[PDB]
Amino acid sequence: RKVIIDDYIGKVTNSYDNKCLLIVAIKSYLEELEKSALIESDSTVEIDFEA
Amino acid sequence: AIGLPSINISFKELATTVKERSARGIIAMVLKDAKALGLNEIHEKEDIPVDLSAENKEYINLALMGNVNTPNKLLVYVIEGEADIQTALDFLETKEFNYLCMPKAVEADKTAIKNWIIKLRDIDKVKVKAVLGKVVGNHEGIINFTTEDVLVGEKKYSVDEFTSRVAGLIAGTPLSQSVTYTKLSDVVDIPKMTKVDAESRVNKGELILIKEAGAIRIARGVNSLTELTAEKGEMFQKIKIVDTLDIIHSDIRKVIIDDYIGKVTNSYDNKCLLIVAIKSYLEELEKSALIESDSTVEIDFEAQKSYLKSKGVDLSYMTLQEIKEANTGSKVFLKAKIKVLDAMEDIDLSIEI
Amino acid sequence: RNVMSGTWGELWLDGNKVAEVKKFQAKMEFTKEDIIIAGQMGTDTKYMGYKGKGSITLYHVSSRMHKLIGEKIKRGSEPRFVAISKLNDPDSYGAERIAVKNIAFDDLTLADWEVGVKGEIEAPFTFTEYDFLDII
Amino acid sequence: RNVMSGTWGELWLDGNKVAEVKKFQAKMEFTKEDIIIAGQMGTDTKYMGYKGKGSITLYHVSSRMHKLIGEKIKRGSEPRFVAISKLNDPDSYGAERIAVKNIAFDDLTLADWEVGVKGEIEAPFTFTEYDFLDII
Amino acid sequence: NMEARNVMSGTWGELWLDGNKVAEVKKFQAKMEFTKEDIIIAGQMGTDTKYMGYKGKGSITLYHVSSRMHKLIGEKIKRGSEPRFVAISKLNDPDSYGAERIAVKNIAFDDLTLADWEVGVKGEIEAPFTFTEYDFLDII
Amino acid sequence: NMEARNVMSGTWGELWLDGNKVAEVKKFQAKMEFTKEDIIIAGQMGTDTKYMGYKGKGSITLYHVSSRMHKLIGEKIKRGSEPRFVAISKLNDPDSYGAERIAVKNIAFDDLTLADWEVGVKGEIEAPFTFTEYDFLDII
Amino acid sequence: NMEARNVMSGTWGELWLDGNKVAEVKKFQAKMEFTKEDIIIAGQMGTDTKYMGYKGKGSITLYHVSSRMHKLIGEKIKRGSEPRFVAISKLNDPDSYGAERIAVKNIAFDDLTLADWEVGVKGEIEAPFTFTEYDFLDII
Structure with a gap:
């Protein structure tokens, strides 16, 4: 929540490329959390197709 | 309207399942009880009405066990202790389903149920089937299960009561597989039966249980249809073939009834267009390996001939093309030929020393 | 005995009847390889x-081909159709x-006209499979 | 029912109406590759x-094409235009x-005449995109 | 006996890779190269x-319909483990x-093609391999 | 399942180099060459x-629209420092x-092309490179 | 942005050699080949x-209009002195x-062509060379 609020709300245009960049940022945060061995290393992020 | 900007993260553990239910397979049960009257759909075990008696609970629990996958949905209709079956049947006409069974019943009511099923299949051309206790009907839509004194646990379940488990097992089977030689873990023992008598009984056309190899298993997956016409086939006795054919027949309804009923003039050109549409639909089913290749759709010549003879038409000295070009008022006759592969049930191995 | 005249010809394209059609023609050409045996x-x-x-050859009564394929051709997706000849x-x-x-159609004719000449449109096509109804 | 005759044809080139025009024609040709599936x-x-x-085909009333493209062709810069056909x-x-x-035009005709023949000029061209107005 | 029609055509072949039928197959080829040493006898x-x-x-050469070749070996190769497959040709x-x-x-495959495309050209992917054993099934 | 339309076409690709989209791209190709040693087992x-x-x-091959390749590495190469880039192909x-x-x-790029032109011929520039790592994003 | 007209054409190039403009030029090409060594890291x-x-x-390839290439280096090569030149391409x-x-x-040039002609063929002279340094002037 803090990461999203700080740099993405209202400062970028809602395009597909920006969505991919935000996905990459979230994936990078999860990978950082991986090295501390809090979760597993199979994390995946993608577009919620059904919603 | 527009609200404050929102960022919400949701955590949910969608991993709570085992023996997942199949998309296909709907069972409808009608029951006699004093409470919970009306339709009560049962998606799973946790949502069971509490006001029901012990007998209905046992029957529903029996019907809740499948072969590989559990049935998609259960429609339980509850009737009062003294009531006629006509009201329940008329209410069920609105609903759609695949199989229908009634655990507690009498000899006279089974005749009404069989007559209703026959009328629905023939007059209305809606493909549904029912599983009945001891009915000797000669129709592919009727399944009679005729073994007695099944010992599930410590109770001598009646044949009509075990028709519920039979229907659940039938609904649970996937399309590719059949119901032959499937073992029932719950059943303990069966009354004595010699091999030749069981073979003759299943030859007559019956659903039975036998003790073979490791444990108890279903002898064969035949239907109640016991005589074959020239038009009818020997493949119509098998349950799996009939189920696939009825699935296909129900599926083509979204092509036929949705658009070509009441919206298009009945002319031979439109008949040809509809034939082309149906063939193009069948090609996709062929490409998914559901049915075999080389399936043809064309005008039913004999039925059209009979309808023409019914009215005042001299069928003599008329060309076959002239017969086909005839305008049959507001009815269309079509005939299709498709093939379905059966499961392995017989093996003949020869060994040379 | 009489030979069929082409005046009595009707064409259905994509489920719609084509009122104006001058001629229709469909053929299957085989592929063969020369083999020399000793x-x-x-x-x-x-x-x-x-x-x-x-x-096909049809008079320029309306803009049928554009409404059929024009936008999809630009977008990058090629449509396929079914035609019936009687x-x-x-x-x-x-x-x-x-x-x-x-x-599948080979080309699209946006506009073509000349002074004193009625417009005509011809569009070649390639197909894969055929089915036969009311065989003589 | 009648088929449109080409006598009633008008052409606008580069925002100027072309008074003399014998015929106009524009076509889109597709590119296809053969694929064999096992x-x-x-x-x-x-x-x-x-x-x-x-x-295009137009009578040699005036020197339109030269005033359009002649000097720019020599200089080394190729101009692009828009044409409207009605x-x-x-x-x-x-x-x-x-x-x-x-x-973009394929060639330029400086001069062409013969004894007893009225002059005619035809200039092929290639285009990339089209837009449709007043569809029938 | 001998006739032109008897010659086999490549359009009628099919290939199974790791138990899954491959429909977008263009050609398949296998061969065995013997090793022989020259010996001079007096x-x-x-x-x-x-x-x-x-x-x-x-x-194997196949049309670039989908990214099939990546999912097989892409992640395993980096880690240091080499998989072995079985192919059937009919x-x-x-x-x-x-x-x-x-x-x-x-x-065992020789290389992996991450990306290969050019403007105006259909995509194709060819993968060479080496093998050790073979069986005969329904040989003519 | 398999159909002619399913084959991917090269006209629909695009390439990002160092975070900047390259519009004048003709073709892009990447490959991984495995190293294998023969072993004879008794x-x-x-x-x-x-x-x-x-x-x-x-x-990478691209039309000579602009002098993009010089600005990346021309001055750095002479001084003795080699840059490393990241490319994305979709x-x-x-x-x-x-x-x-x-x-x-x-x-890392193999060569730099200062000038290449001929009378009557349009200009093109091709640059080969070598890489070490890769990721999979939205694989089919 | 990107358009067909933006591609450079070789007809518009020109070349200055030793401060004198060369008008009979056909093509000019320069390139830099990097040297890289494989390193395996455990x-x-x-x-x-x-x-x-x-x-x-x-x-450099140029039409045989005049004997320009001889006057530059022909006599100096025999004596044992090698000249160095500067070329500018626009x-x-x-x-x-x-x-x-x-x-x-x-x-520094690689070879000198004394004579090359054939009946029915127009004459052309191509001369390869090697260089060490370069400048950027008005890069795009």
Whole structure:
């Protein structure tokens, strides 16, 4: 929540490329959390197709 | 309207399942009880009405066990202790389903149920089937299960009561597989039966249980249809073939009834267009390996001939093309030929020393 | 005995009847390879496939082809159609119908006109499979 | 029912109406590649793009093409134009207009004449994109 | 006996890779290269050879319909583990005398193609491999 | 399932180099060359191989619209420092099943083309490179 | 942005050799070949390379209008002294975004063509060379 609020709300245009960049940022945060061995290393992020 | 900007993260553990239910397979049960009257759909075990008696609970629990996958949905209709079956049947006409069974019943009511099923299949051309206790009907839509004194646990379940488990097992089977030689873990023992008598009984056309190899298993997956016409086939006795054919027949309804009923003039050109549409639909089913290749759709010549003879038409000295070009008022006759592969049930191995 | 005249010809394209059609034509061309077998002067051939080709010719009454394929061609997705041809000469004994499936058009004619000449449009096409109805 | 006659044809080139025009023609030709799929006798095709082609034919009333492109061709910069074609036969129900954009001409005809013959000029061209106005 | 129609055509082949049928297949080839050493024997001019072993080689070419080749080995190669596959080729021409089927085992691939495209050209992917064993099934 | 329309076309690709989209791109190619050593095992005729590593290779060809390639590395190469880049290739054909994207990392270029022109011929520039790592993004 | 007209054409180039403009020029090409050594690092499968230097190569092809190439180096080569030249290439296409100019320095030629002719064939002379340094002037 803090990461999203700080740099993405209202400062970028809602395009597909920006969505991919935000996905990459979230994936990078999860990978950082991986090295501390809090979760597993199979994390995946993608577009919620059904919603 | 527009609200404050929102960022919400949701955590949910969608991993709570085992023996997942199949998309296909709907069972409808009608029951006699004093409470919970009306339709009560049962998606799973946790949502069971509490006001029901012990007998209905046992029957529903029996019907809740499948072969590989559990049935998609259960429609339980509850009737009062003294009531006629006509009201329940008329209410069920609105609903759609695949199989229908009634655990507690009498000899006279089974005749009404069989007559209703026959009328629905023939007059209305809606493909549904029912599983009945001891009915000797000669129709592919009727399944009679005729073994007695099944010992599930410590109770001598009646044949009509075990028709519920039979229907659940039938609904649970996937399309590719059949119901032959499937073992029932719950059943303990069966009354004595010699091999030749069981073979003759299943030859007559019956659903039975036998003790073979490791444990108890279903002898064969035949239907109640016991005589074959020239038009009818020997493949119509098998349950799996009939189920696939009825699935296909129900599926083509979204092509036929949705658009070509009441919206298009009945002319031979439109008949040809509809034939082309149906063939193009069948090609996709062929490409998914559901049915075999080389399936043809064309005008039913004999039925059209009979309808023409019914009215005042001299069928003599008329060309076959002239017969086909005839305008049959507001009815269309079509005939299709498709093939379905059966499961392995017989093996003949020869060994040379 | 009489030979069918082409005046009695009707065409259905994509489920719509084409009122104006001057001619229709569909053909299957085979692919063969020359094979020479030792000890034989005559040369034999092996059949290895076939190709479907055809064309339509219709008067420029309306803008049918554009409404059919124009935007999808620009977008990058090519549509496929089904066409039905019927030939029923009253003098001849019977009729004949053919269903041609998986049709793809070779080109699009936006505009073509000349002074003192009525407009005509012809569009070649290629197909893969056919089905036969009301065989004579 | 009547088919539009080409006598009622008008052409706008670069925003100027072309008073003398004998015929106008524009076409889109597709690019296809043969693809053979294992297990199938018929051969299928994949669509890869298209090309725009066309031409004009006009009487030699004036020196329009030179004033259009002559000096820029020598200098080394190639100009692009937009052409509009309108076909409105009073007998037919409606009219039809097309905008053809990004036009480039294939050649330039400095002079051409013969004894006893009125001069005519025809200039082929290639285009990329089109836009449709007043569809029938 | 011999006739033109009896010659097998490549359009009628099909290939199974790791138990899954591959429909977008263009060509398939397998071969065995024997190893032979020259030996000169006194008193004879003609040189004679001794057979010592064989090496198996081949390749598969397929239309770029989907990214099938990546999912097989892409992640395993980086970690340091090499997988081995089994391929089955069936050639069934209606005109010829029946069909022949062969299983090629212990297949290991030579390279992985991450991306290959050019403007105006259809995509294709070719992958060479090496094998060790084979079986005969329904040989003519 | 398999159909002609499903084959991907190269006209629909695009390439990002160092975070900047390259519009004048003609073709892009990447590949991974495995390293294998022959091993002869006693008692078996068929030779078997052991996998030891891989080498990455590729190239980019683009129209000579602008002097993009000089500004990247021309001054750095003379001084003795070698830069490393990241390229992303996306292939999105409307007919095929979606799109596939791949990131190629640690790219080092093989040569720099100062000038290349000929009378009557349009200009093109091709640059080969080598890489070490890769990621899979939205693979089919 | 990107359009067909933006591509540079070789008809618009020109070349200055030793301060004198060469009008009878057909093509000009210069390139830099980097030198890289393979390095295997323990624990990683992908091989990595180290950049050590570069080598410059090129060539000039021109119509045989006059005996220009002899007067430059013919007499000096025999005596044992090798001259060095400076070349400037300018590519100025009106449609493209401006022009780019490059100076190639320390040019030494590979060979000298005394005579080359054939009946029915127009004459041409091509001379390859090697260089060491370069400048950027008005790069796009």
